[PDB]
Design a protein around this ligand. Structure first.
Ligand SMILES: [Mg+2]
Ligand SMILES: [Mg+2]
Ligand SMILES: [Mg+2]
Ligand SMILES: [Mg+2]
Ligand SMILES: [Mg+2]
Ligand SMILES: [Mg+2]
Ligand SMILES: [Mg+2]
Ligand SMILES: [Mg+2]
Ligand SMILES: [Mg+2]
Ligand SMILES: [Mg+2]
Ligand SMILES: [Mg+2]
Ligand SMILES: [Mg+2]
Ligand SMILES: [Mg+2]
Ligand SMILES: [Mg+2]
Ligand SMILES: [Mg+2]
Ligand SMILES: [Mg+2]
Ligand SMILES: [Mg+2]
Ligand SMILES: [Mg+2]
Ligand SMILES: [Mg+2]
Ligand SMILES: [Mg+2]
Ligand SMILES: [Mg+2]
Ligand SMILES: [Mg+2]
Ligand SMILES: [Mg+2]
Ligand SMILES: [Mg+2]
Ligand SMILES: [Mg+2]
Ligand SMILES: [Mg+2]
Ligand SMILES: [Mg+2]
Ligand SMILES: [Mg+2]
Ligand SMILES: [Mg+2]
Ligand SMILES: [Mg+2]
Ligand SMILES: [Mg+2]
Ligand SMILES: [Mg+2]
Ligand SMILES: [Mg+2]
Lengths: 211, 184, 176, 157, 49
RNA sequence: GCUUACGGCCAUACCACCCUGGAAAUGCCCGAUCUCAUCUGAACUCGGAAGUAAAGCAGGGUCGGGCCUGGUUAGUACUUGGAUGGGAGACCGCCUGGGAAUACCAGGUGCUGUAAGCUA
RNA sequence: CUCGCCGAUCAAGCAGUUUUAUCCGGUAAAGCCAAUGACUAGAGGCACCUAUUCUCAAACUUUAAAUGGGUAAGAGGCCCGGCUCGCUGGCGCUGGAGCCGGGCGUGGAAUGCGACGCGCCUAGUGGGCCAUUUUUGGUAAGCAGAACUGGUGCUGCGGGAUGAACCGAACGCCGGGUUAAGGCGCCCGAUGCCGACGCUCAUCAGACCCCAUAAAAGGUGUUGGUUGAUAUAGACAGCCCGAAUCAACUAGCCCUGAAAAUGGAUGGCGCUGGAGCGUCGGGCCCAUACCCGGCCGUCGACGGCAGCUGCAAGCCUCGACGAGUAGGAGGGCCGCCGCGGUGGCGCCGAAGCCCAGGGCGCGGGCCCGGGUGGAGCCGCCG
RNA sequence: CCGAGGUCCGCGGCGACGCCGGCCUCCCACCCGACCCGUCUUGAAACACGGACCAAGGAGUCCAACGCGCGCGCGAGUCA
RNA sequence: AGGUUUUACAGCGCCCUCCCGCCCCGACGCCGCUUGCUCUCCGGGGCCGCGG
């Protein structure tokens, strides 16, 4: 296909696959969660992200290639059930390609820029400065392997990425310094891979079900 | 002058602060040229009687005037003139608008003939009514032709930038007096 | 900010505009280093507007005066905590200087941050300036001047006044 | 190019507010619009009769003609570089009384209320409005309000 | 031989050259377009006072 | 205070469940001769007064949902104007002004006009 | 031409501007645990169902700016009385509107300005181009197509070596002064400062808007910085010795990455305690810009006149102003040919022609002198 | 006289061309500036066209009718 | 870290007082902002005084 230098900058408005943009090929990446995705919150406390530093658009092929690069390194260093990689960028922006412009012809309705609006070529994920690309939650002693697994996957992406070990507990939105205190007060309950926030502002029957 | 010192001293002796009254008078100098002006800024400079570079006017400071100075900020360099600035500008650069004409204030008969109804009969009345703005500031300030100031002797830091970020445009609180001594 | 010449220290205090809903709002004092008071008042509305919910129009400046050096004739070690935005990101940085006045040490920091890190004055945010004792200095370039009975010559004196005699039969001496 | 349809681009201006659909509240029907009063123009998609054009949505004019269900308004419309006085017929569901001159009429009655007091007291209280004057000189006490030292916080990624 | 289709570039400078004059609302504005029944009675109230 | 008639704003008024209440009034209720009405006196229409709170209705209740208001988010996001600012670029910082929204948190939950009537 | 200033910012009226008040909107942002649509993951309950979760919209949106659009800020107002009506109707006052009379300036935001007032006739143009920002198609284009504003076309001048468009600043002819943008080793005006601090060595160094390319990725080159860990219960390194050491990360400059054809380009020379990079100070250099003055013309005057003038179509005073293609208008004691008048000139030499002579006018042009020439010629009013 | 903008009620050497004056113009030299005009064009010094040189000739007219402005005569008339 | 352990055979801080112990210099070739009309036959250089 066309090199990623041509569809790197968010130059056009977001052009999603919808009722109007028909004929989009399937994105290269179809799986976004890997590892032991069916793990509890207290099993993978650590969390590290691949934060984007540039306002660009990553192709679905790069998201798929970096996912495989990060997945293979986590298996050989932490086991197939010692991590949970979550690609947090879904390719929704559809990039277009113009016709295979040739010398001339008595057909194709054009030869040059006449009717230049192109057909859907692929899908990219418009990422923002500070937006997480990939997230990996592992055990506390696997920090060196996650930083290296995400560092190798940066080479599959254009631009500049930063590997940041988050202060949040796992894939939740609560800090580690506040997580274990909220479990004791029954304010958070484990719901699958993460926790579900339970406020003190519902029916009291739901409060009795916790205690 | 001695009253503002007494008020500032009695507040510091009690451990408090004395915030002086915000300035009611400003002196606006057009620093940028005339070619390539935005139409909104161009209209404001015409209402300030600043139609050429390096000319000055006095502006009675209120919210209606300050928001006109903010909307024409990159083209002006204004501030709060002291008495010496107001005094020397009307003495050296002081020209009156008698009948749509730029007439030099060489005698008090030229001020008394036009501003005599407002009680302004001498050139010190014109200085007093402008430095300490009064009920007749508009007629007194509009009587004065826009002060045709000379180029700043010693140059400027940089004209295309605001005074805070190292340039000269915008509002310099009392440093406008340094600019007047070099342009007047 | 331009950081023209020396960066004098200003004690700029300010507060929100009082209202009937909030009479006598809290007063906030800042430690601003600026070339003049006009920039000091403008720097105040930049660091305070990002700490509290108050703009230049929402509040007022109560006092803005110079903070003179209490010991201009004593050599002091200054530890400066600052943050600057490089071409890639923002970095917290602690630098030590040795000057006679606080405003002189902060002025050295802006000349040094631009020399070693290409940081402009608008990208630097001085967070803390503190007179550090000689026991608590972390940089080795400062601790070398913490030697009593310090002795060093002035080797290889570079010739100045190169154009007072522009032409001369004497080649300059560099040893003195 | 575009179409010259009478409602091209009126997808949101003629729509109704969220959770404000249904029948028009009847107070809007029982408002009296005399001749010469200032009224706003805000078209509604519910009443497809007597709708103003999209160029008049948000404009303000005075009434010159009143009918059974509608009102004649004289509105200013800038075509290219000239402003023209347009006489449009709009039903009362798309208009409302303009509170623009209400602040003026309130001040007129208040000016006549304060100057007759001067003829009975002997004062000269100024009636003109004035822009926000510079803040007068005031003392800021620090008795129970000490200036708190603020510092820029370190950077956190 | 294609050309430029549409532009409003210099138009604003041409509009304000002679100024964008507002319509002069003269005193005693005209009575064209008023309700014919209303005008009919108004002309009866003028020929009898 | 309450019950109705007509309403105004049109959820602070809605929704779910629970509890309480009949002084007047309301509702249910009792009938189909007449007017009327349907497959069917259920409805609609008409005639009436044996019962009186089951429902409607009203008033409470719920760490209620929703809604409303405010705080927080946040001087954040974004944005007017400025630079011979930075950066290969993508973009970013500053100057001058304006200034959001959700999550989250807290409070509140119909107000009222005209007319008639009644003090459980 | 109608006026206003004259004849008192008298006041109106106006505005590519604010202020105050009042509306209008659905873009940025935000949101989807809110609807429509898209999409990831588990979890609970008896494939669904419930509570959560990841990620999105240009033709989605609860919400919602900045900038912006309209309107209102008085005598054309406000208040009061009477009258008219065939319209309206319980109610000649029930509405409504019209007509008439009376009362009340503290003209009831800021700033500016004579009204960009009212007409008539009207050329040129109807290929545009460019820049900041916004923005569509396209891999991109010194591409194509839009929006706001400026510029340019139509425009020279200082600076960017060079240049259409960048930066400064727009232009009558000058003197002095001072600046802008940009500069001050030499070319080349100005640092020939005993300028401040630091960074940096390049066997392709670097050298400033537009702008004349360079990246991902690397460096035990070098200088800062961040965060940890071992250390006088003896670390690190070397094979006991005796004091700091180690690791990761990051940021500047430099280096690698880095290959094109005639010989060549920070503009050139060259510069390495610099003539480089970053942060700054003082002094200095000059634009047709600004300030003061002289002069020319134009415009305006709320201007002056019925010993010298007074050709009033003249004269005098004061103030401001001055770019220009296409185009328009005015003035010409500019020029040419003939006519009606008028005033002349000429064989003692007209016209024409020539000139290193003397001059006048901003200029078109003109006068005079000299030479040649040999018979006609010119001024002024038409 | 710090006053409606300058005067000297100060003065020197040369003055009949040898040794004085002549802006501009002639020749020459230097410094700074400076690409070829016309034309079409968004853009011309253009590797766009026309032009080797000089003289003379050479292109907005006249007629009809119309419009508006102006001068003039008379005027509900006016023009024969 | 001077003298041999904190002033001793140098000095450097920080508190409590002693009228602020008391006197002396006021931004002064150690560091700012300005007249509340800064004062000067107060000096020097350049430019030109045109008209009437
Ligand atoms: Mg410019
Ligand atoms: Mg600019
Ligand atoms: Mg269409
Ligand atoms: Mg149509
Ligand atoms: Mg219909
Ligand atoms: Mg064509
Ligand atoms: Mg076309
Ligand atoms: Mg065209
Ligand atoms: Mg019950
Ligand atoms: Mg609730
Ligand atoms: Mg035309
Ligand atoms: Mg045409
Ligand atoms: Mg184009
Ligand atoms: Mg032009
Ligand atoms: Mg130009
Ligand atoms: Mg260049
Ligand atoms: Mg000059
Ligand atoms: Mg140079
Ligand atoms: Mg790199
Ligand atoms: Mg390698
Ligand atoms: Mg390095
Ligand atoms: Mg290199
Ligand atoms: Mg002048
Ligand atoms: Mg001209
Ligand atoms: Mg002829
Ligand atoms: Mg000759
Ligand atoms: Mg001559
Ligand atoms: Mg041609
Ligand atoms: Mg061409
Ligand atoms: Mg060529
Ligand atoms: Mg040829
Ligand atoms: Mg000829
Ligand atoms: Mg015609």
């Amino acid at each position: 296909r066309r090199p990623a230098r041509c569809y790197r900058y968010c130059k056009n408005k977001p052009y999603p696959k919808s009722r109007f943009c028909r004929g989009v090929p399937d994105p290269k990446i179809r799986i976004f969660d890997l590892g032991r995705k069916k793990a509890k919150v207290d099993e993978f406390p650590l969390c590290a992200h691949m934060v984007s530093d540039e306002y660009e658009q990553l192709s679905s092929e790069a998201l798929e290639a970096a996912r495989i690069c990060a997945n293979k390194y986590m298996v050989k260093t932490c086991g197939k059930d010692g991590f949970h990689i979550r690609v947090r960028l879904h390719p929704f922006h559809v990039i277009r390609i113009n016709k295979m412009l040739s010398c001339a012809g008595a057909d194709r309705l054009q030869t040059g820029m006449r009717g230049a609006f192109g057909k859907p070529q692929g899908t990219v994920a418009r990422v923002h400065i500070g937006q997480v690309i990939m997230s990996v939650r592992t055990k506390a002693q696997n920090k060196e392997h996650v930083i290296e697994a995400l560092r190798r996957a940066k080479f599959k992406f254009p631009g500049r990425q930063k590997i940041h070990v988050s202060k949040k507990y796992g894939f939740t939105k609560f800090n580690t310094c506040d997580f274990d205190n909220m479990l004791a007060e029954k304010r958070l309950i484990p719901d699958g891979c993460g926790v579900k926030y339970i406020p003190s502002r519902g029916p009291l029957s739901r409060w009795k079900a916790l205690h | 002058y001695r009253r503002e010192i007494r008020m500032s001293r009695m507040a510091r002796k009690a451990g408090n602060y004395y915030v002086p009254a915000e300035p009611k008078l400003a002196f606006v100098i057009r620093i940028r040229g005339i070619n390539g002006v935005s139409p909104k800024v161009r209209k404001v400079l015409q209402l300030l009687r600043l139609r050429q570079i390096f000319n000055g006017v006095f502006v009675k400071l209120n919210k209606a005037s300050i928001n006109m100075l903010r909307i024409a900020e990159p083209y002006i360099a204004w501030g709060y003139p002291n008495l010496k600035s107001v005094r020397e500008l009307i003495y050296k650069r002081g020209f009156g608008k008698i009948k749509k004409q730029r007439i030099a204030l060489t005698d008090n008969s030229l001020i008394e003939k036009t501003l005599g109804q407002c009680g302004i009969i001498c050139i010190e009345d014109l200085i007093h009514e402008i430095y300490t703005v009064g009920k007749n500031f508009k007629a007194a300030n509009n009587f004065l032709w826009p002060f045709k100031l000379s180029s700043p002797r010693g140059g400027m830091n940089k004209k295309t930038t605001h005074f805070v970020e190292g340039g000269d445009a915008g509002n310099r609180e009392d440093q406008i007096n340094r600019l007047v001594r070099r342009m007047n | 900010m331009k950081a023209s010449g020396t960066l004098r220290e200003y004690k700029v205090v300010g507060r929100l505009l009082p209202s009937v809903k909030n009479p006598a709002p809290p007063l906030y004092r800042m430690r601003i280093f600026a070339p003049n008071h006009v920039v000091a008042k403008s720097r105040f509305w930049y660091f305070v507007s990002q700490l509290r919910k108050m703009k230049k129009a929402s509040g007022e400046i109560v006092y803005c005066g110079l903070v003179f050096e209490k010991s201009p004739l004593k050599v002091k070690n200054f530890g400066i905590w600052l943050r600057y935005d490089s071409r890639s990101g923002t970095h917290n940085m602690y630098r030590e200087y040795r000057d006679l006045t606080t405003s002189g040490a902060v002025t050295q920091c802006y000349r040094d941050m631009g020399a070693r890190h290409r940081a402009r004055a608008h990208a630097i945010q001085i967070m803390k300036v503190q007179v550090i004792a000689a026991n608590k200095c972390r940089r080795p370039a400062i601790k070398q001047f913490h030697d009593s009975k310090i002795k060093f010559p002035l080797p290889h004196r570079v010739l100045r006044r190169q154009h007072k005699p522009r032409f001369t039969t004497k080649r300059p001496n560099t040893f003195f | 190019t575009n179409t010259r349809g009478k409602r091209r681009g009126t997808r949101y201006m003629f729509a109704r507010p969220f959770r404000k659909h249904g029948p028009i509240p009847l107070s809007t029907y029982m408002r009296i619009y005399k001749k010469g009063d200032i009224v706003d123009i805000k078209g509604t998609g519910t009443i497809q009769k007597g709708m103003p054009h999209k160029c008049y949505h948000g404009k303000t004019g005075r009434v010159y003609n009143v009918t059974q269900h509608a009102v004649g308004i004289i509105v200013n419309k800038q075509v290219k570089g000239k402003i023209l006085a347009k006489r449009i017929n709009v039903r009362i569901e798309h208009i409302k009384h303009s509170k623009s001159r209400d602040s003026f009429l309130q001040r007129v009655k208040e000016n006549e209320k304060k100057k007759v007091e001067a003829k009975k007291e002997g004062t000269w209280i100024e009636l003109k409005r004035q822009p926000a004057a510079p803040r007068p000189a005031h003392f800021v006490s620090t008795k129970n309000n000490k200036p708190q030292l603020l510092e820029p916080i370190p950077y956190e990624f | 031989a294609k050309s430029k289709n549409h532009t409003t570039h210099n138009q604003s400078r041409k509009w304000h050259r002679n100024g964008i004059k507002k319509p002069r609302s003269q005193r005693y504005e005209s009575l064209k377009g008023v309700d014919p029944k209303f005008l009919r009675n108004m002309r009866f109230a003028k020929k009898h006072n």
